[PDB]
Design a protein around this ligand. Sequence first.
Ligand SMILES: CNC(=O)c1c(-c2ccc(O)cc2)oc2ccc(O)c(CN3CCCCC3)c12
Length: 269
Amino acid sequence: DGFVRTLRARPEAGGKVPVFVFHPAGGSTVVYEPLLGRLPADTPMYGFERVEGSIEERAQQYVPKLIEMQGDGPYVLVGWSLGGVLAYACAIGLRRLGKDVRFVGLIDAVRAGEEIPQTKEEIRKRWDRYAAFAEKTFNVTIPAIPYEQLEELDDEGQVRFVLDAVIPAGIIEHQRTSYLDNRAIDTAQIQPYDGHVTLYMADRYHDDAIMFEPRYAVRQPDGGWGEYVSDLEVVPIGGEHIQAIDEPIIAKVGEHMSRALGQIEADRT
Ligand SMILES: CNC(=O)c1c(-c2ccc(O)cc2)oc2ccc(O)c(CN3CCCCC3)c12
């Protein structure tokens, strides 16, 4: 299927408006199966899996596919983790092309409480933190970090440089894509969007997330989306980021989202 996974196929003709879901960091759209079970019967669902590039470059790949599949609209775009940002970026692209986007659902796609700087000083502090965790984890001494060579490299190049030093192909492939998908969240440059966004908000990021990047230890009440989205609804769901996508918490998301879908179906009926 390329990068589109069919979770529930739309009928040959007619039917309900499909929900387009976007993969999480380091994972696939199979994670949306619990959600799908909490959505109305015969709600079609398609998942957009990983593609390469910056967020904008990824949306430039998704948007033509969205249009091929759904045309003028209506568009319902949903994502947890990185998927939320991808969904949001696609919403901007679709709106810019005159399409009708009716719903953007961010499932705990929460920004760091303080903006993560994209600076050399930050690149050094980041790699120093990693090196220190490796020292403790692997009972090793890491020599001086070749900062100068690292600083000049993008995220992709940084991991290749690192993967020269150090393994089964599946693990390198899984670690590489997880790291890069997570950095993609970190460095996302949010643009403003004038349509409705629903943010399902958990209480906090899980411990591993925070150990990796302590700025995710703090969340703003709007999840960092308020300056960019004037039409913003927050649906608190509690719990941690990791749990937001699974039962039982997904039942709450599903109930709320089902109501939104019902109104959309009513509005076209
Ligand atoms: C739990 N580890 C992670 O979350 C991160 C990984 C990673 C690497 C390998 C793997 O197998 C699984 C994950 O690489 C990252 C890079 C930057 C970063 O800021 C983070 C933190 N992350 C927290 C959620 C909001 C987005 C940022 C991570």
